[PDB]
Amino acid sequence: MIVLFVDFDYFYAQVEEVLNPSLKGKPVVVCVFSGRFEDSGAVATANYEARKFGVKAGIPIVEAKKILPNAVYLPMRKEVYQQVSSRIMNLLREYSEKIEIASIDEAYLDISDKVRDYREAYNLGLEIKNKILEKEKITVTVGISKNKVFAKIAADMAKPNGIKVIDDEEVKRLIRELDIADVPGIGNITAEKLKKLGINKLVDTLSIEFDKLKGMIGEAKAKYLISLARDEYNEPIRTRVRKSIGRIVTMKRNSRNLEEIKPYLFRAIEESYYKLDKRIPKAIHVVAVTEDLDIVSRGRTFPHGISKETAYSESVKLLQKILEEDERKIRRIGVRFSKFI
DNA sequence: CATTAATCCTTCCCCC
């Protein structure tokens, strides 16, 4: 099997560069203003200019302006990036019909039935990069190996504007010499549980009784990590349908007053129903981020799909339920819709 | 300071 993964480079910022090319060369920071005080918010992403100086995603916009007061700061326009992403995906779609659009920025391609070895793969890689560069003026990085996970890892090593092949020989070496923390799916919390069990490389998973590993990190991750270390991992590249749509907003200020929070919530619902576009959910969840950044949520599945007015009144009850069951003030409020017909 | 969504886990619950 030959898997080709494609990840677009500093994507939102690159798109903002593409739409106003003057930005090239300057440090560009795409960020999400939360409407509280001025420059309250976080960084969605930044280009490599900004990222050289520690300005990355998640950091507050205030920390970034301390570091790079004279960088260009731009509000996020996801719908634009979304439309551009769709178009790029369609190019890739003309190199295989076996394609998993994982996210706005990433896609994997099964090209087993197209090319025949890792050289031809490399060629296919360049001519795809070359294409997206021509057609859309966007830099991507390309990673190639025998499964999805190693193809993704390949790309992470290669970025930016890279291409890399991990042939069946280097996989064997990486099972031994790659940090478990650099495996897809192993966030902080998992990585620290694996150091405690004395697992710092992929191979050390074999060392331990399955049933203990299952205890610490769950069966599914255990099996995933085990299969990976045995050169046995091989999930198929499959299309994926969106299962959930929703939206959270930040309030100008924290609150527990029902009437103060309602309008934020109703706005969240309307934006959600527009985004649904002829999709009908049987389930609704109200989510709240509390003053100290804990997350609480309350849901309901219906035997039928949900009208807009039903969502309005049902959300208010669920919000009432959240307030009655947690005494903290609420910072962000929103909805998620799911279980489409 | 701190701005969408998938999948997994645990706990209930109903019931053969």
Added chain:
DNA sequence: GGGGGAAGGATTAC
């Protein structure tokens, strides 16, 4: 005992 499905939370990653 165990299937099935719902709720609420935990974790990850973009």
